[PDB]
Amino acid sequence: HWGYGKHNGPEHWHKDFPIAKGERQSPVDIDTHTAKYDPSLKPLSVSYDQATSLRILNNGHAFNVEFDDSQDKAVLKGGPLDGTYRLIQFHFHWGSLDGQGSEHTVDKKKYAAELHLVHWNTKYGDFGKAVQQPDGLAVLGIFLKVGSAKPGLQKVVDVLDSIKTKGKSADFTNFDPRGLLPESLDYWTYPGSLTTPPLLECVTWIVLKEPISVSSEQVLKFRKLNFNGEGEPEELMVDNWRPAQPLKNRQIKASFK
Ligand SMILES: Nc1ccc(-c2ccc(S(N)(=O)=O)cc2)cc1
Ligand SMILES: [Zn+2]
Numbered sequence: 505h506w507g508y509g510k511h512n513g514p515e516h517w518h519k520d521f522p523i524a525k526g527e528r529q530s531p532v533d534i535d536t537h538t539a540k541y542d543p544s545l546k547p548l549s550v551s552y553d554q555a556t557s558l559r560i561l562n563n564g565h566a567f568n569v570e571f572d573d574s575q576d577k578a579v580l581k582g583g584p585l586d587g588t589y590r591l592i593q594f595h596f597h598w599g600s601l602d603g604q605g606s607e608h609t610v611d612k613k614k615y616a617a618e619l620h621l622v623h624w625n626t627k628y629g630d631f632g633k634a635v636q637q638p639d640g641l642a643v644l645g646i647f648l649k650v651g652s653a654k655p656g657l658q659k660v661v662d663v664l665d666s667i668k669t670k671g672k673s674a675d676f677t678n679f680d681p682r683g684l685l686p687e688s689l690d691y692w693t694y695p696g697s698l699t700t701p702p703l704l705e706c707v708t709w710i711v712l713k714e715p716i717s718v719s720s721e722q723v724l725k726f727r728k729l730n731f732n733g734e735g736e737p738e739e740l741m742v743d744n745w746r747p748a749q750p751l752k753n754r755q756i757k758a759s760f761k
Contacts, residue, residue: 506701507565507731509739514746521701528705529749530696531607531645534756539692542757548689548710549582550644550682555591557679560663564670564731565700566595566744569660569679573624573631578681580623580642583710583759584693589623589642592631594681596620597699598726600742602650605723607699607745608711610647615715616723617648618745619684620699635698640706646686647715654718656683661725669734686714690760699746713760 506512506520518524555578559570570593571578578591598617599605606615621644624634634640648654659679666674690713697705729741 508744517701517703521703523697523703523705526697526703526705527752528695528697528754529703530699530707530709531609531746531748532694532696532751532754532756533609533612533748534692534711536611539756539758541761542759545584545693545757545759546582548580548691548759550580550685550689552578552591552680552682554578555679555681557676557681559673560660560667560676561673562667562670562729562741564733566597566741567664567667567729568593568595569676569681576626580621580644580710583691584708584757585642586639588626590626591621591623591681594619594621594684596648596726597745598648598723598742599745600727600740602720602723604743605745606647607748608645608647608709609748615647616650617718617726619646619648619716620644621646621681621684635702635704635706637706638695639708641698642708642710645709645711646684647712648718648723649715650720650723651717652719653722654684654716656680657718657722661722664725664729668728669730669732669736671733684716686712686716688712688714690714690758692756692758694754694756696754
């Protein structure tokens with residue numbers, strides 16, 4: 505029953521998920537002046553050429569574009585990571601207004617939305633196992649600002665009318681997630697958590713410095729989705745973001761000077 509409403513939103517989650525008040529919760533504010541360049545950080549290796557998208561699902565909290573992760577087909581390596589992380593899904597968090605929607609903030613700036621490409625550490629065998637480990641997941645976070653359209657996002661936007669409500673899914677094959685990346689792979693990185701229940705502290709966060717731009721029409725279509733199931737009172741899927749959590753005993757590292 506957790507959600508993003510007045511009565512079940514982020515400030516309530518701790519009652520069912522006590523880890524909500526844990527030592528490495530996400531998202532966080534990225535204070536760019538305090539983040540330290542780490543010369544020992546490697547370039548990110550994003551290898552998405554062999555990606556196999558399968559399906560798009562409205563899960564009542566966001567929509568997931570899901571990939572075949574039964575083989576090393578689309579993987580993230582390098583950067584802060586040891587080993588190989590397989591792409592399982594991507595999704596977004598977004599606002600009711602262009603001035604909010606991102607989970608991470610940059611010097612307190614909120615972006616219109618945030619893309620999360622979720623990967624799991626292959627040494628743990630599958631995703632369910634991986635989320636139980638402190639280095640189980642790597643989530644690549646990419647900010648969205650409103651300006652010019654992102655041509656690579658349009659295929660996602662156009663299928664949304666077919667998954668308007670919670671529990672709806674649609675075939676979604678041959679989608680290339682490379683079309684969602686910015687030019688630069690400069691990043692910040694820190695140890696954190698899932699940003700929704702179960703809020704497990706299993707994520708190495710890698711957040712790209714360069715946002716992608718999407719059009720107002722593209723984000724407007726995100727905002728036409730529903731949190732509710734079909735035949736239930738319409739509640740627009742908007743503001744499905746958790747606010748910044750205390751940094752506590754963590755340092756944010758930068759890949760760039
Ligand atoms: N069972 C289960 C396992 C993991 C998640 C989950 C996965 C990724 C994220 S996020 N928003 O990418 O940090 C948040 C939650 C949700 C449900
Ligand atoms: Zn997310």
